[PDB]
Structure 1
Amino acid sequence: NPCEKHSCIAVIDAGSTGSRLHIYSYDTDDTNTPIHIEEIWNKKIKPGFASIQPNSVTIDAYLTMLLADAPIHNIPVYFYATAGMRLLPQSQQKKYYDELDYWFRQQSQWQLVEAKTITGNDEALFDWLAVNYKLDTLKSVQNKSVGVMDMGGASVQIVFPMPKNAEISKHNQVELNIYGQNINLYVHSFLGLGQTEMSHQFLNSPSCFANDYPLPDGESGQGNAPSCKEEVTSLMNSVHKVNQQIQPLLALNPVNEWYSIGGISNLASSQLFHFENSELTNQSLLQQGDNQICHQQWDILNGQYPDDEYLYQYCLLSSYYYALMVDGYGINPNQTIHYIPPEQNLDWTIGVVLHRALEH
């Protein structure tokens, strides 16, 4: 039992496409800040919590499945939901949390401490903490700016260092104290621009699917990634005004190294894309999507690569990552974007270990 000699907590990423339970062990330094954070248990379940029926039978089955087989008793649990839950009004969220609270009161293995929806700004802070913890950049003052992007299913987050700016909403800025240093961050989360939500506006766009892919409207795919990218850019910028919000800030506060987590890590490490050193450029991601997916014959490609359930979306998703990064955030197409390998099972929940407070 690691938890008899180290602190342990359980954090659940109740994300839009699935829930991920992690039990972390850790020690603390002389200010009671966690160090030596190690994942000692994990379990994932699909679909997203906020997609299932909020009735006792269904919620019981789902929590029972997520929380089974753990070899440690009486661990405190922090259940934190993200953008899937944030699509729902507070009265509907309440139904889920009342049922989850009841479930936890009927059992004796886990100790529920908190179950709630976090804000997108909370989620972005945790995204930056998680990646910077893994990079070992938190303990000392850095001379390089690290930006993080989390490519989720219901929202996307961008977070990067920026001094306090009295002309920007308080909600898009966080003053972080961690290991005795003060870090000021810009945070933004874009609700509805996550993969799943975005994709529901383009399912009948022939440019976004392999040739002859059967679109729901009965038309055929006719892939063309630059064209698909321009369609996604219209949602990015004509609808959400990503470019107007983000690019002036990055122009004055440039990021020196970009790291990404979320679906782009899974795409870029699939059998269909080919990148070295766990990094990509947007130029190469669009080119590979266009040649290896968009302009292929769908039945031929699907027969060649039968095991990847995201295959049919890779023309759209490569186009969409480029639209978000290059046309929305203004990142140069040749700038290196590091992505964290999916096998590391890194998500924002490491940030909760380090920093318990949430926006009030």
Structure 2
Amino acid sequence: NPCEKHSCIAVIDAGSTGSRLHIYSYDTDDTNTPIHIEEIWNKKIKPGFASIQPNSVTIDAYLTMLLADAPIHNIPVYFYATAGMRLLPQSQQKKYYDELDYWFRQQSQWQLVEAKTITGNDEALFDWLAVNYKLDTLKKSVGVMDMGGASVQIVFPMPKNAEISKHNQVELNIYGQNINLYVHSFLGLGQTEMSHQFLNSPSCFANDYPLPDGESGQGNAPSCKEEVTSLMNSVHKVNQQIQPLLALNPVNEWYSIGGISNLASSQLFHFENSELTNQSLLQQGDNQICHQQWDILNGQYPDDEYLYQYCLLSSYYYALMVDGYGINPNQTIHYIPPEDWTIGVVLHRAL
């Protein structure tokens, strides 16, 4: 048993499509900081915690399902909900947490540290730490983009300044050294939530795709991008808030976690070495989905669940990274598959 020879912790990612429980074993260096972080357990249940009825029966039954069969007991647990939960009013959220609190108090096998909806900024911080641990780069400026179901996050080094809001900035000391980060999160710009604004725009789907209200897809990536861009800059003002900061704090290497990898390593996009550029992404989306005829394209992939959405998503990614953030179309973006960020919680609690 790993946890007889090592420290162990559970982190629950209470995300938008389901909850995923992670259990990690680890050692600690000279400063009681985790090293040799290894995931020893990993179970996901569906749907998201924010999408279940908020009462004792449903919640008790939900947690029981997530946690009954876990191979290690008597370890600290963190339950962290992200953007799906941020969409509910604080008053609705409290109902979920008060029942969850009562469940965890009646059991003797888990030791709950906190159960809460984390802010996207905190989410950003855990993303950055997880990736930098993973790349063995915690001793060049590293940037992280996390593309989620309901929100997206961006994080990268920036010296502290009092002109920029306190919630958008973090300082920490890490394996001996002082790192200041800018954290941002855009609620509503996740792929799932943004997409609900564009389901009727012909330019975002393959030719003759039947759109929800009866019109036909007439796919064109450049055009769909500009539509997505209207939402990013006119509404959320991504460009105005992010671009001038990147202009003063250039990033050396970009890592994207979350949904981009699902698209990138689909049967429909082709990249090598887990790297893309937005130029190639938009061009591939344009030629390989947007200008394809839906009948024929569905004909080759009649059993694939998000193919239909790939003209819009390639267009969205470009809009966000290039028109929002102001990353050069030719700048390499590395990507990690979602199959992670909860490694960031293991790390942050020992600083």
Normalised-by-shorter TM-score class: over 0.9
2:32 and 2:350 in contact (8 A); partners too: no
Provide closer, same or farther for how the CA distance between residues 166 and 13 of structure 1 changes in structure 2, counting only shifts above 3 A: same
2:347 aligned with 1:351: no
Take 1:38 and 1:357, find their aligned partners in 2: how far apart are those partners?
Answer: 17
Provide closer, same or farther for how the CA distance between residues 293 and 276 of structure 1 changes in structure 2, counting only shifts above 3 A: same
Take 2:47 and 2:292, find their aligned partners in 1: how far apart are those partners?
Answer: 30
List runs of 5+ in structure 1 lacking aligned partners.
none
Take 2:7 and 2:303, find their aligned partners in 1: how far apart are those partners?
Answer: 40
Take 1:245 and 1:192, find their aligned partners in 2: how far apart are those partners?
Answer: 16
1:246 and 1:328 in contact (8 A); partners too: yes
Take 1:4 and 1:32, find their aligned partners in 2: how far apart are those partners?
Answer: 18
Offset at residue 25 of structure 1 (A): 0.5
Identity of aligned residues (%): 100
Provide closer, same or farther for how the CA distance between residues 191 and 164 of structure 1 changes in structure 2, counting only shifts above 3 A: same
Take 2:310 and 2:54, find their aligned partners in 1: how far apart are those partners?
Answer: 32
Q: Which residue of 2 aligns with 1:97?
A: 97
Moved more, 231-240 or 100-109: 100-109
Q: Matched residue of 1:342: which SS?
A: coil
Offset at residue 169 of structure 1 (A): 0.8
Question: For this pair of structures, how many residues does the alignment match?
Answer: 351
Offset at residue 36 of structure 1 (A): 0.5
1:224 and 1:294 in contact (8 A); partners too: yes
Take 1:64 and 1:296, find their aligned partners in 2: how far apart are those partners?
Answer: 46
Offset at residue 62 of structure 1 (A): 2.4
Moved more, 66-75 or 195-204: 66-75
TM-score (norm 2): 0.96
Offset at residue 225 of structure 1 (A): 1.0
Offset at residue 17 of structure 1 (A): 2.2
Offset at residue 357 of structure 1 (A): 8.1
Take 1:293 and 1:34, find their aligned partners in 2: how far apart are those partners?
Answer: 44
Could you report, residue by residue, the CA deviation over 1:191-212 in whole angstroms, capped at 9, with x for unpaired residues?
1111111011101111111122
1:14 and 1:49 in contact (8 A); partners too: yes
Offset at residue 65 of structure 1 (A): 2.6
Could you report, residue by residue, the CA deviation over 1:88-145 in whole angstroms, capped at 9, with x for unpaired residues?
1211101111122222234444332211111111100111001000011114xxxx11
1:278 and 1:341 in contact (8 A); partners too: no
Match of 2:288 among 262, 279, 292: 292
Could you report, residue by residue, the CA deviation over 1:215-260 in whole angstroms, capped at 9, with x for unpaired residues?
1111111111111100000001011110010100101110010000
1:11 and 1:77 in contact (8 A); partners too: yes
Take 1:200 and 1:265, find their aligned partners in 2: how far apart are those partners?
Answer: 21
Provide closer, same or farther for how the CA distance between residues 204 and 69 of structure 1 changes in structure 2, counting only shifts above 3 A: same
TM-score (norm 1): 0.94
Provide closer, same or farther for how the CA distance between residues 117 and 342 of structure 1 changes in structure 2, counting only shifts above 3 A: closer
Q: Which residue of 2 aligns with 1:273?
A: 269
Take 1:348 and 1:3, find their aligned partners in 2: how far apart are those partners?
Answer: 21
Take 1:353 and 1:76, find their aligned partners in 2: how far apart are those partners?
Answer: 11
Take 1:269 and 1:83, find their aligned partners in 2: how far apart are those partners?
Answer: 25
Provide closer, same or farther for how the CA distance between residues 16 and 357 of structure 1 changes in structure 2, counting only shifts above 3 A: farther
